[PDB]
Amino acid sequence: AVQQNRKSRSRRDMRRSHDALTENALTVDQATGETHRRHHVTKDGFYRGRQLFA
Amino acid sequence: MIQTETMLDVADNSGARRVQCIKVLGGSHRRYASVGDIIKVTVKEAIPRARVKKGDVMNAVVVRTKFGIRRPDGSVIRFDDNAAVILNNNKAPIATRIFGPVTRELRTEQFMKIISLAPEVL
Amino acid sequence: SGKHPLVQAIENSQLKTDLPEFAPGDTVVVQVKVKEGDRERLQAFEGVVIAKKNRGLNSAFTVRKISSGVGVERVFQTHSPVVAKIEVKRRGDVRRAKLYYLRDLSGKAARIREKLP
Amino acid sequence: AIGLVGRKCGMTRIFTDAGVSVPVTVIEVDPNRITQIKTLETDGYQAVQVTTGERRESRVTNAQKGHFAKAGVAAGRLVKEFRVTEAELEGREVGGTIGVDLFTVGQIVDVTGQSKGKGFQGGVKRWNFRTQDATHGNSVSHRVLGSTGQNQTPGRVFKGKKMAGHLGDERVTVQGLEIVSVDTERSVLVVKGAIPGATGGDVIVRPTIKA
Amino acid sequence: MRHRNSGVKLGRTSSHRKAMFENLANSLFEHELIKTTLPKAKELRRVAEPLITLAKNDTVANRRLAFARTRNAATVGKLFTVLGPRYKERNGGYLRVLKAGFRAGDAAPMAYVELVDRE
RNA sequence: GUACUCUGGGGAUAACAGGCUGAUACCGCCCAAGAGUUCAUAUCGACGGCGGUGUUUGGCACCUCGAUGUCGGCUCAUCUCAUCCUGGGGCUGAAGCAGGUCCCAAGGGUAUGGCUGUUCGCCAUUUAAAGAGGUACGCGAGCUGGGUUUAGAACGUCGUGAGACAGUUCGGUCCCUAUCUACCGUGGGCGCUGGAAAUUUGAGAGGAUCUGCUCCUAGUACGAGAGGACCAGAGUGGACGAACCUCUGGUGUACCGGUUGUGACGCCAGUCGCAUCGCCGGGUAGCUAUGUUCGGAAGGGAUAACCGCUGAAAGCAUCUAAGCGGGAAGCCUACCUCAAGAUAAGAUUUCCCUAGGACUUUAUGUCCUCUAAAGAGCCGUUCGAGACUAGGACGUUGAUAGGUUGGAUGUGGAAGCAUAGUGAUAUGUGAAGCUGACCAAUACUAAUUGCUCGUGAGGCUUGACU
RNA sequence: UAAGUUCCGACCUGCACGAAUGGCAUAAUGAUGGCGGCGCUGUCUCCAGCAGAGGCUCAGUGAAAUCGAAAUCGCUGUGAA
RNA sequence: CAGGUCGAGUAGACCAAGGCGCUUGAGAGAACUCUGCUGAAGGAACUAGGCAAAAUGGUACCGUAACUUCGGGAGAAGGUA
RNA sequence: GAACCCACUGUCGUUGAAAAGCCAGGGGAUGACUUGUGGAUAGGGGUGAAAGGCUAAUCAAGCCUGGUGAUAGCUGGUUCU
RNA sequence: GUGAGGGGAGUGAAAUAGAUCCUGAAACCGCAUGCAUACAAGCAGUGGGAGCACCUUCGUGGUGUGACUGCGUACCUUUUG
């Protein structure tokens, strides 16, 4: 099964009208004060005022 | 739970030894027969010189099944074989002895004789 | 006690309080209440306990016996009022909970050794 | 009619004196509280609105808080309406309660619930379609639909054709059940038979309409 | 449907799954802090915590059960000499699972598994 | 001669399906010799005549030969009525039970096997009944491939032969990941006269609609007897459908045990890996039928054929022309589910927002500063909810998930150590040990500090009260 | 066989058998053609549960045949029908 | 060329010496498709046709019909430990 | 009955892992057996335990280059006002 | 990233002549501005026609858009069509 007519650019863009991306949830940490992904350990090993690597 | 092509033992001395069910009576597209239901059977093995012969088409009533019967209190009773008793054209019992135990589902005006001649009713 | 507290409370009100202790492999006599018309009588069922389920009010046990050449098994609901009396006659000695292997043995092979105190 | 909102607690059995075993379902009832009464003059029909259960303040919104505070009853976990008549409306006021004593043993009722969800299901389970042969050369078509239409006439599929799709999770009413026990101390209804839904679901009990 | 069912699959056979979780538990007991994927980390609790619970009573039968489950003598010795007395007074919750972003190779979500009183 | 075949062309021209036609076919009507003890018309009806339908056999050659690719079976259907069953009637050569014929009626229902590739047919045994047709002689981008119709081989027959068939027999490759329309499910956007959380009315749509047997009336009415009811009640079944898991069972590769081979853990003991979960016996939750429960009950309204009341035209008669009735499983309601995108966008309860400047395009006008409410969402712990979504519960003012403690259940007599035995093994400690998904408690672990969206009283005209 | 257009035995008005294009038989042999039994079974009544691989979601790479152009609904009729 | 434990064996299960984990992964655990395991009662009713599945299966001993070209048929069939 | 040589049935695969395969079963397996190296037979010819089979994925007359721009009462196409 | 690629500085008449570097068309693919578009059925145009935005010689002007409305089944070939 294949198309009988080539699809127009208009209909192609209409189909793609649902492809937009979305933003993550970011938050400024307390103890250190940089941005991190919410509910995740910061890239330097801190989470809720505890250190993972001394 | 007896259906077409099921083989059954014969629980009386009418002469037949093994019968095969060929029809479940009593409704369109009816699937199964349980204790107390009428079936059509063909005779597959019989005692020599009997009143019944091989190749006869007859009526029968189911007396024991392996699938079992339910009771009002939630219990179930199961037997080791499937057995039947032969009837005439008027659907009355036509035997002079019964072999093995029987149930209460035959407490019906149609079926006093089997109970009366049976040794044990459990 | 795998159910909700309300269900347990409603079930506990109907329990029997006089059942004997028995295990698979014993031989028992059960008195069954039979109501023919309004004649009341008791019918005796004697056999070997081959399976037992302990589930509170939903407890059950299966009894197998040979009657005039045909084997027959009945599953009794323990707490039903139709079960009038249970008597243990002889305590068996087995190695497992369910004795379904007895269905394929007859007579000489189906004997159970007696447990000796 | 006027009924009750309860919760399904589970299935069990009741033994009678003769020895008969009756399968039953247990319905836990927290006494319903009347929040609003609707009339012909204001709304154009007659109904009683009730609430039951509990809900925490952080989860009750301000609008619902005011709505409950006007009636003078605590916030519940759900709100429901019962269509009534003038005769049934006698003796009912905002702030009163309805209990299990509304029913009697031996009464015939209808029970409404939300059936279990089976998800995406095919023809065999959804519509009792028959499978094709497992052998004798069949290639890859055992549980498939089969044919779905005729031909150039009409050259389409009719509306309402039975196909695969979502099954379950629907409102279902079971009619003609019988009340077996009305336990007032425990606030429990015990009714014969099975009712829709899973344990913990919300169910509605009303007097039977097949009167 | 999978109503009320427990357990994971993770695209492995049952023996492979069981062996992999035994390996993870051994590594966790050795190093006290490991990094893995989030589903593996969340399932690792149901396997590792009962071992610590069992190691609270030092008996020959308990040691043999621990060996039957771990197949590692050093792990058994550590469990019955260090970790058990450490958690004698703690009612569960010996592990800690923390989300740690995603992995470069396949964008898989990751997590850290750490013992509660590591240092 | 070519079925071992090949190239150029044709729907200028055949086989399939469509189309036109209706001789043929099927169905209906008109006349009525006669048959029916008399009596054409209860039921048949010669000789002749007039139509309808578009099922059969055909006629034509308009479409397709730069391809519309199948005789039956399977699966899934939808419509007609010229009705097979069930429902309502008129007449009868209708005593009753039954039957014959015609009228109304399309709501539901409407066999399993033996033989053959069969459609069909014959046969066996059922049923209330096993209807007649249309849909590309419905359905092969949904399945098959037994028949026919390629290439091999043989028989009968024909031909000198290559070969052939009002014939027979054995064997013989069935491709396609679905763009559009349609259909089954499930979301995103915007709209609905400021915004928000809930509860709702019902224009309308869909589902369902079947029926046997026994008892009672009553061995009564009827009948010479043999037989044997209408109307009106009760009970219990078949098939179909839905929900559910208390009971009976199945499954239950994260639960318990027995056992074979081999390898390892230093060795004994004790265990683990591999052999289809190695094999074997059980089995908790969940799912499930063969298990359990429930449904098609009753009642209103208008009618079909048919039966009337009163009544003239037509001094009588007459259901009709004025007027007034009864009447069916059929129509509208009634029962269940969905339903305001019903753009006509409906209703009710409650909640939120009332600050200052400048400018011209004097307008629900545009730019500053100040304000972010009721709520919604992102995120997290998750679910008897689920493809992704959506929906439900909870986020420290906490039992949402895991763990821990207790219980329950299943399997069944752990390890170690003692006794008795030469030993295999048996007994005691002890119904012990171990026990996924279940019930109940319990902050030990994880649901952090947060962020985004949503605003600042909601134009005009007319009317009624204020 | 309850029921047999196939099978087996016989009958012989052989449409149109017949003796080295061999006739009638024949023990053994055949992934050879037809018919009937025992055992066995999910072939079936009528399907249910479970395990692995896909399907589905996310990150990376990235085809195909086809295609005059498309703002590409139903019905009844019409019309190269 | 080719070892060990069983074994008639270079068959087979698990191992030695020696080689490897096969150049996309991570989740989820719907319909439907492929490959497997189990299954109540019935047991070919399926179908062109028992197609496919299920079933039998070792060693030693006992016992074994018609028919026959006297070799066979024959591991006939069946039974025991 | 393994190796080895074949190719009877079924599922899958059919824009395949593969321009003829995989998996589960199947046949022969001291012989008219299987196989390596090197040779012989050349197109109206060869070879064939015979199917019009094979003769480099091509066979009722191989492939390549020439005659050659073969012929086509046939189909298509044929460009500004 | 001591990469690729770019931004400045500099050379040159010219670097949008910067190395696959003269000119740089079309298919095809982006970003920005103006207007229209989420109650309405089809070869997508054509004859009317309100409103809006910018320009303006201030119009009976120009440029862009086209709510609503009458009519309207592509092109070629071959054909009785």
Give residue limits of the domains in chain E.
Answer: 13-115
Secondary structure element (H or E) that encloses residue E18, with its range: helix E14-31
Cβ–Cβ < 8 Å for D196, D169: no
Closest among D7, D88, D86, D71 to D33, alpha carbons compared: D71
Closest among D105, D187, D101, D100 to C10, alpha carbons compared: D187
Cβ–Cβ < 8 Å for D176, D211: no
Cβ–Cβ < 8 Å for B79, B59: no
Main-chain dihedrals φ then ψ at residue E42, nearest 5 degrees? -70, -35
The backbone region for A45, taken as left when phi is positive above 0, alpha when psi lies in -120 to 50, beta otherwise, is left
The structure tokens 């809900």 sit at D55
Which residues in chain B are closer than 8 Å to D13, comparing Cβ atoms?
74
| CB atoms B76 and C74 under 8 Å | yes
E110 in contact with chain A, both atoms CB, cutoff 8 A: no
**b (16+ CB within 10 A) / e for E70-106:** bebeebbebbbeebbeebeeeeeebbbebbbeeeeee
DSSP-assigned letter for residue D26: E
Which residues in chain E are closer than 8 Å to A43, comparing Cβ atoms?
101
Cβ–Cβ < 8 Å for C73, B77: yes
How long is the CA D23 to C1' F405 vector, in angstroms?
35
Q: Rounded CA gap, C24 and C38, in Å? A: 35
Among B73, B75, B76, pick the best mutation site for testing chain D contact (most D Cβ within 10 A).
Answer: B73
Main-chain dihedrals φ then ψ at residue E103, nearest 5 degrees? -100, 145
| C9 Cβ contact partners less than 8 Å away, ≥ 6 residues apart | D186
Which of A:32-51 have CB within 8 Å of E? 37, 39-41, 43, 47
Beta-strand runs (E) in E22-90 = 33-37
Q: Rounded CA gap, C50 and C98, in Å? A: 6
The residues with which D50 forms a beta bridge, in sequence order, are D34, D80
Nearest CA to CA, how far is B77 from chain C (Å)? Answer: 5
Q: Rounded CA gap, D98 and D150, in Å? A: 57
Nearest CA to CA, how far is E112 from chain A (Å)? Answer: 9
Q: Rounded CA gap, C78 and C30, in Å? A: 11
Protein-covered nucleotides of chain J (CB closer than 7 Å) are 28-30
Q: Which tokens belong to D107?
A: 């009464």
B69 in contact with chain C, both atoms CB, cutoff 8 A: no
Give how far Cα B80 sits from Cα of A24, B21, B65, B75, B99, Å.
69, 18, 8, 17, 14
How long is the CA D118 to C1' F386 vector, in angstroms?
9
Fill in the amino acid letter for E10.
L
Q: Rounded CA gap, B87 and D87, in Å? A: 62
Nearest CA to CA, how far is B95 from chain C (Å)? Answer: 19
| CB atoms A41 and E99 under 8 Å | yes
| CB atoms C71 and B75 under 8 Å | no
Domain ranges of chain C: 1-117
Closest among B32, B38, B35 to B105, alpha carbons compared: B35
Structural domain total, chain B? 1
Experimental determination approach used: cryo-EM
| E26 Cβ contact partners less than 8 Å away, ≥ 6 residues apart | E70, E72, E75
Our CA dihedral for B82, B87, B90, B95, rounded to 10 degrees, sits at -140
CA–CA–CA angle A19, A25, A29 (5° rounding): 160
Residue E24 in 3-state DSSP? helix
Cβ–Cβ < 8 Å for C80, B85: no
Fill in the amino acid letter for D104.
T
Q: Based on the number of CB atoms within 10 Å of its own CB, is C67 exposed (0-12), middle (13-18) or buried (19 or more)?
A: middle
E99 in contact with chain A, both atoms CB, cutoff 8 A: yes
Fill in the amino acid letter for B52.
V
Which residues in chain E are closer than 8 Å to D168, comparing Cβ atoms?
none
Among C70, C82, C103, pick the best mutation site for testing chain B contact (most B Cβ within 10 A).
Answer: C70
